[PDB]
Structure 1
């Protein structure tokens, strides 16, 4: 058993890049499924999906990331495990092919605890590079995913190259706890295991701590209405973003209990998603677009479905 949902290229609809996004979202889902069918942890499955998403030269993450003001690459990525509730993140990272690998490495090391000090969950800049290299992570010469395994464990990750020409050192939502992604297994105050991954305007997602907000709203009965209400009230109409002339963001959501309800929503013109069940064979891709006449950054688009795992 196992299910996976991924996203790439949220933003303005490209009647050309669309084909490319579908392609990589297809194989990102394939790799995630492979991992799960090989009995891998949900975090390694979501990590494998991100590596594939990052490696596509068309995605603003890993290889092909946007160059900053100095024509340099600085990447943000993070990952969260719903079972352990642990998290790993890197910000303004360069020199590493797959930022999500550094984040996942920080997560695993974090799960080992003081076995002789509380481990770091968030590293940035040169220090993040040295740390990655020191742990064997391949030093060179927005995308995301949510996963749930046969046991019902969930995981989420997000990776981005951030804004083109951004000032050096600028860190976005993909590196920030609660903002870029979230994953939380069922608990006393969490009737559902939920996983979230975001995309869009970094600052907008950060100010509203969107990822975590969606996870909390999703504890309600109606997943569809829960997400819609969040995108409308907690995002578009958030007082924290009142000064903004348009709110741009996208999110993919997974909720289980195995009954898996998966959804995606965005205020951007469009967003590409790919999803697959381990007992489904072949991933499905889809270019989600805002309804006709809907204004980007002022309206919402939401689609989804259900899936039963075994």
Structure 2
């Protein structure tokens, strides 16, 4: 049987201050631990990435769940998606408001409905009948996010995880608040199968982050896979696809990928992308290029 692995990422974004790097280090290791945990018990690729993403949704350092950036109206409107490489079963939501964990609801969409994509008010109604707790806006809002909003007015990207399990299934999960002063009801790549992620057992899985208009226009995650189906290393593929994204539509960001045969990589063309990976009891972490650290992980 396979050796399981989880890979996680934060924003493919600008350079991050070195106090915020510490809470970022700890948050990444956390999400990674919840996913590896579940795996190491022979659990599924789907639950692990869901585990991991959920831990970054509940952390206000990251641009997903609580700590989601604010739209034009200073409100949190969130996107998330999930996919299982075995059946290509999938679930997603756009523009959801007033809940803790948009990624759970994507998973609720994947397994309770014969659809794959619910948005704004219809997602919010599905939530009610699944009894998702509806909570006030402020509980997701951080004082940092109000400040940053007046900055781009008076003139931290997606989060995600990929996994391979001890059975050989892969999955991806993605979630985000979108972007600062985004138009109302703006939908990013994070809920667009192929763009914000893809998962196929006969290939591998990918979670992306960056400029989401760019990402959607090149189908960045499925493109990364196209390079692997042509038999490139995982490294090369990400580099062709990220490299295509730069040269064709002037777009920066990054992605994490795991192929069906065990290998995995975290690459980016933006400045920094927090990331972590947990395989064989070692944990791999980093933010800036060629700055990795390996630790041990129970």
Q: The TM-score by the shorter chain falls in which range?
A: 0.7 to 0.9
* Deviation by residue 1:192-244 (Cα, 9 ceiling, x = unmatched): x3010001111010000101110121121433222222222x31122xx2xxx
Structure-2 residue corresponding to 1:203: 213
Query: How far, CA to CA, are the matches of 1:108 and 1:165 in structure 2?
Result: 33
Structure-1 residue corresponding to 2:120: 125
What RMSD in Å do the two structures reach over aligned CA positions? 1.9
Structure 1 contact 91–124 (Cα < 8 Å) conserved: yes
Query: How far, CA to CA, are the matches of 1:81 and 1:231 in structure 2?
Result: 23
The number of residues matched between the two structures is 268
Q: Please, what TM-score do these two structures have when normalized by structure 2?
A: 0.85
Q: Which runs of 5+ in 2 are unaligned?
A: 137-157
Query: How far, CA to CA, are the matches of 1:44 and 1:136 in structure 2?
Result: 20
Structure-2 residue corresponding to 1:160: 176
Flag as ranges the 4+ runs of structure 1 deviating above 4 A: none
Alignment counterpart, residue 13 of structure 2, candidates 11, 14, 24: 11
Query: Secondary structure at 1:66's aligned position in 2?
Result: coil
Alignment counterpart, residue 97 of structure 2, candidates 94, 97, 105: 94
* Deviation by residue 1:108-143 (Cα, 9 ceiling, x = unmatched): 225xxxxxxxx2210110211110121122322410
Query: How far, CA to CA, are the matches of 1:183 and 1:263 in structure 2?
Result: 15
Query: Secondary structure at 1:179's aligned position in 2?
Result: coil
Structure 2 contact 42–165 (Cα < 8 Å) conserved: no
Q: Which runs of 5+ in 1 are unaligned?
A: 111-118, 187-192, 292-302, 306-310
* Deviation by residue 1:39-58 (Cα, 9 ceiling, x = unmatched): 32211111010000111111
Structure-1 residue corresponding to 2:164: 148
Q: CA deviation at 1:15?
A: 2.3
Query: Secondary structure at 1:174's aligned position in 2?
Result: coil
Structure-1 residue corresponding to 2:195: 179
Are residues 1:256 and 2:260 paired?
yes
Query: How far, CA to CA, are the matches of 2:21 and 2:108 in structure 1?
Result: 31
Query: Secondary structure at 2:12's aligned position in 1?
Result: strand
More helix by share: 2
More strand by share: 1
Q: Please, what TM-score do these two structures have when normalized by structure 1?
A: 0.82
Q: CA deviation at 1:290?
A: 8.4
